[PDB]
Design a protein around this ligand. Structure first.
Ligand SMILES: N[C@@H](Cc1ccc(O)cc1)C(=O)O
Ligand SMILES: N[C@@H](Cc1ccc(O)cc1)C(=O)O
Ligand SMILES: [Zn+2]
Ligand SMILES: [Zn+2]
Ligand SMILES: [Zn+2]
Ligand SMILES: [Zn+2]
Lengths: 457, 459
C-alpha cells in the first residue's frame, strides 16, 4: 500500500458534524473508582466544557471546577483530541496539566456517548500516562452529563396577565388561522374558498382576497396585512408588559478558543436569546440539514446579517412598497427567524422532547398548556418570549421604510391612524388601506375557528 | 416576475469571498471636503477596521481614532453593510452613531477598491448625511482609506547578526535546497541524472541504496529518519547562536471582529510574527489560489492542523509508527502545509514589492541571495523566515513524544544514542537505519558543485 502524497483539506462529514454537535457544550463531571484522582481537583462537583468547529475534526475543552472555568486564569486541565475514526461508540482525548509547565499530556481518556430519556451522557476510563500498562489495572473512570440547555421561557418570564392572554384558545386559534388561510389560500379549491367565506375567514376583502404565498404575493398588498396585524398584536401586548424590541440580532456563540467564560455563559442562555441547538428529524434528512444550517454561524453571516443590513438601508427600502417590503420580509427573514430560535417540539403534559410535530388539525386540550411555545407553529409561536423580541425588530423596520421614502420621495407617504394604530395612508407606496385583522375587519368564536382550520387541513 | 417563495442559504462565491478578503483588516482613514465632518471626530488621524466572515456576505466594522478602536469602550461609529452586488467598483455601508443612543444609521457610504503598486489596498468614495435632503446643494463629503501594511515575520522577529549571517550564506541556501531537491525528486530522475548526483556525492542517502522521499516506498525506506535528523541537526547549530524557543501550541486563527475588537486589530499588526499572512491570488492558476486560500482558512485549522497537533502528541497514535514512518508522514502532510500557511507573498530581493512569479529553481542570480528573501515556499530560502524555526522546533519536540510513546507500550525496544553530536536513537525495531543523511558529509561544501547538481535535477 501507498501513503498519501500530500495533505488534503479534511472537512468534517455529516457523521462527524453531528458528533461534534453532541459534544459541544458544558458538562457536569464525576470521578468514580479507588484510583480516581486528578492533581488539585476533587472527585465530585467537576465540569467538562468541550467545543468543536462547525466542520472541524479537532476536539478542545477544559476540565476544572465550575468557578475556575469561568475565571480568567488558565484552567487546571486542558483538553486536546480529534474525531478521526470516532463515534458514539468511542471518543478519545488527552489532558494537559496547565500547572505542570508542560504541554505534554498527563492522562489519556476514552468515552462512549449515550442517550437517556428520563441532554447527553459520556462515560469512560482515564489512564495515568506515568503509570505503566503492565501494572495492575487502575480503577479510574468518569461519568459526564450534558447540562440542560435552558429554554427561553425559563429565562424570560411573561406575567400572568400577558401570558394568560396568549395561551387562550381564542388567541392560539386566531393566530394559527390568520396565517393558515392566507398561507394556503392559493391552493384551496373553490369549494373550500366559498366555505371560508361562509365563516368570514377569507384572507382580506371578500371577492378580492390577498393570497400570501401565491404568484401575485408581492403585488397584491398581502405584505400590508402581515405588518399591520403583527403590529396590532404588539400594541395590545406591550400594554400588559414591557416588551423591548431587539436593537441588534444576537451574534452566534463565541468560540471556546477566544472567550472561555463567554462560551460557557452562552449555554446557560442567560438572556434567553441564545440559539437552541438543532435537532435531527427522524426519516427526514433533507429537513434536518436545512434546520442545521439555518442555525449555523455561516448562515448568520450569509443571510441574517444581510437582512439586518438591507431592511435598514434607505436606498434598499426606498424601492419597495409596503406590500412588497412585507411580503419579502415575511417569506424570507420572518420564517427563518422563527426556526433559528426554535426549540424542539415537546409534549405539553411532561415537557419531554417530542419528535413528531403537532398536527395542524389536532386540537387536543393538552396542546393549550403554556408549556407549548413551539416557534415553528403559529398556533404556539406567539407564546415564546423570543417571538416578541424579533417581531418588535421587524415592526421598527417599518419606520426605516417610512424614513427612506421621505428622503427619496418626500411627501408621497403620509401617516395615518388605523384601528387605533399608527400606520400610513393608501398611496403610491401603500397599496391598500384596509388591513386584514381577521373577521373583525372583513367579516371571536372558538368553535368556528376549529371548523375553518379543519376545512383547510 | 415572481419573487422567491422561501429563503435559501446564500453562501459567498469565489468573487464574493475575494472581495471580503480585500476589505478585512485595518485601514487609515482621512476625510476630505468642505462638509467632511463626523460628530466628535477629527478629519485626520482616523482608522477604519472592517471584517467579513470566511464565506459571509455581510460587512461590519468600526470607525474611530486608533486609540479608541483598541480601547474597551464602544467606538464612536459602527459599520453595517452587505456585499450583495458589490465589487471593486462599488461597495456600500452605513454608519451608526453609537453615542446618539440609536441604532438608526446617520450616514450612507459608498467606495471603490483600488490597488497601488508604487499600502496593501485603497478605498475611496463619498459619505452622505441622512438627515440632509438630497435636493439640497451637493455636499463635499468624501474619504480616502489605505489598507495598512501587514508586517512581515522578519519585521517582528529579529535574528541576530551571527545567526542571520549563517542562514543567508550561499553555502547554506544551496545546501538546504539541494538536500530537499534530490530526495524530493529522486524517484523521477533518469539513470543518467542519478549517476551524476552520485558523481558529486549528492545522492540521497547511502550510495546504491538511496532513500527516495516521495516514491512508493517512501514510508518504509527510512527516508523519514533523514527528514527528522537533518532538521534537528539544523536546529542544534542554529540554537547555539541564538535562543529559538519552539512553539508550544499552534497559533489559533484570528479572532472574529465581533468577539474581540482589540484582539482582531492586534492580529493584523503581527506582533509575535506568528500571524497567518493573508493569501494571495495567483495569476492564471485558480486551482493553486483556491488551494492556498483554504490552506490558510480557519476551517483548515480545525479540520487538519488541529488534528495533526492532536495525533502527533497522542501516545496510542505514535506507538504504531516507526521513526521512518513518522518522519515521512509528517513531512509530506503537515510540514509542507506549515510552510505555506505562514508563508508571505514572494518578494523581489531589491525592493519589498511583491513578485508574482516565484523564483525558478535553477535561477541563481545574485539578488536572490539577499536577506530580504525569506519565502517559506522554497527550501532555498525557507530557513531564513523566523517562523521556520518555531514550527520546526515544534516538529522536533514531537520526536520525543514518539520515544515516550514507545517506552509506554514497548518498554526497552527503543534506545537513545548520540549521533554526530546530536541526541538520537539506536537502530532497532522502531529505528530503521542508523546513518542519517546530512548531505555529502555523511554519505560522500562546494558552492559550484551544488549549483551543478541542482541544474541536473531541474534542467
Ligand atoms: N413555522 C413556519 C413559519 C411560521 C412560524 C410562526 C408563525 O407564527 C407563522 C409561520 C416555518 O416552517 O417557518
Ligand atoms: N515548497 C513546498 C514546501 C516546502 C518548503 C520549504 C522546504 O524546505 C521544504 C518544503 C510547498 O509547496 O509546500
Ligand atoms: Zn411570526
Ligand atoms: Zn404570526
Ligand atoms: Zn521545512
Ligand atoms: Zn527543510
Amino acid at each position: 500500500p501507498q501513503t498519501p502524497d500530500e495533505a488534503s483539506l479534511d472537512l468534517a462529514a455529516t457523521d462527524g458534524i453531528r458528533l461534534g454537535d453532541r459534544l459541544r457544550g458544558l458538562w457536569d463531571l464525576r470521578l468514580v473508582g479507588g484510583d480516581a484522582e486528578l492533581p488539585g481537583l476533587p472527585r465530585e462537583g467537576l465540569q467538562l466544557v468541550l467545543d468543536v468547529a462547525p466542520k472541524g475534526r479537532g476536539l478542545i475543552g477544559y476540565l476544572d471546577t465550575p468557578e475556575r472555568l469561568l475565571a480568567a486564569e488558565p484552567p487546571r486541565f486542558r483538553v486536546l483530541g480529534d474525531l478521526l475514526g470516532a463515534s458514539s461508540a468511542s471518543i478519545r482525548w488527552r489532558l494537559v496539566d496547565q500547572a505542570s509547565g508542560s504541554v505534554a499530556p498527563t492522562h489519556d481518556c476514552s468515552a462512549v456517548f449515550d442517550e437517556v430519556w428520563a441532554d447527553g451522557t459520556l462515560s469512560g476510563r482515564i489512564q495515568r500516562l506515568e503509570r505503566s500498562p503492565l501494572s495492575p489495572n487502575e480503577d479510574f473512570r468518569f461519568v459526564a452529563v450534558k447540562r440542560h440547555f435552558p429554554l427561553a421561557h425559563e429565562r424570560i418570564v411573561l406575567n400572568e396577565k400577558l401570558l394568560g392572554w396568549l395561551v387562550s384558545p381564542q388567541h392560539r386559534l386566531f393566530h394559527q388561522l390568520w396565517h393558515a388561510s392566507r398561507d394556503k389560500w392559493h391552493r384551496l379549491s373553490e369549494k373550500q374558498r366559498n366555505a371560508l367565506r361562509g365563516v368570514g375567514w377569507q384572507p382580506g376583502p371578500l371577492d378580492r382576497e390577498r393570497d400570501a404565498r401565491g404568484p401575485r404575493k408581492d403585488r397584491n398588498a398581502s405584505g400590508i396585512d402581515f405588518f399591520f396585524m403583527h403590529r396590532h398584536m404588539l400594541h395590545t401586548a406591550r400594554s400588559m408588559q414591557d416588551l423591548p424590541s431587539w436593537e441588534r440580532l444576537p451574534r452566534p456563540v463565541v468560540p471556546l478558543e477566544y472567550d472561555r467564560p463567554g462560551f460557557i455563559r452562552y449555554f446557560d442562555n442567560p438572556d434567553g436569546f441564545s440559539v437552541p441547538p438543532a435537532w435531527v428529524a427522524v426519516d427526514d434528512d433533507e429537513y434536518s440539514e436545512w434546520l442545521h444550517g439555518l442555525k449555523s454561524a455561516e448562515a448568520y453571516h450569509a443571510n441574517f446579517l444581510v437582512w439586518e443590513s438591507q431592511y435598514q438601508d434607505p436606498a434598499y427600502l426606498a424601492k419597495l412598497t409596503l406590500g412588497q417590503f412585507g411580503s419579502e420580509l415575511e417569506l424570507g427573514m420572518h420564517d427563518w427567524l422563527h426556526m433559528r430560535w426554535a426549540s424542539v417540539t415537546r409534549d405539553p403534559s411532561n415537557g419531554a422532547p417530542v419528535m413528531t410535530d403537532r398536527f395542524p388539525a389536532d386540537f387536543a386540550p393538552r396542546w393549550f398548556r403554556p408549556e407549548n411555545d413551539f416557534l415553528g407553529d403559529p398556533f404556539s409561536s406567539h407564546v415564546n418570549p423570543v417571538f416578541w423580541s424579533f417581531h418588535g425588530w421587524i415592526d421598527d423596520r417599518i419606520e426605516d421604510w417610512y424614513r427612506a421614502h421621505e428622503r427619496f420621495h418626500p411627501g408621497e407617504v403620509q401617516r395615518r391612524e388605523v384601528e387605533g394604530i399608527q400606520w400610513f395612508a393608501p398611496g403610491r407606496w401603500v397599496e391598500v388601506g384596509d388591513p386584514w385583522l381577521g373577521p373583525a375587519t372583513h367579516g371571536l368564536d372558538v368553535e368556528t375557528m376549529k371548523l375553518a382550520l379543519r376545512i383547510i387541513f
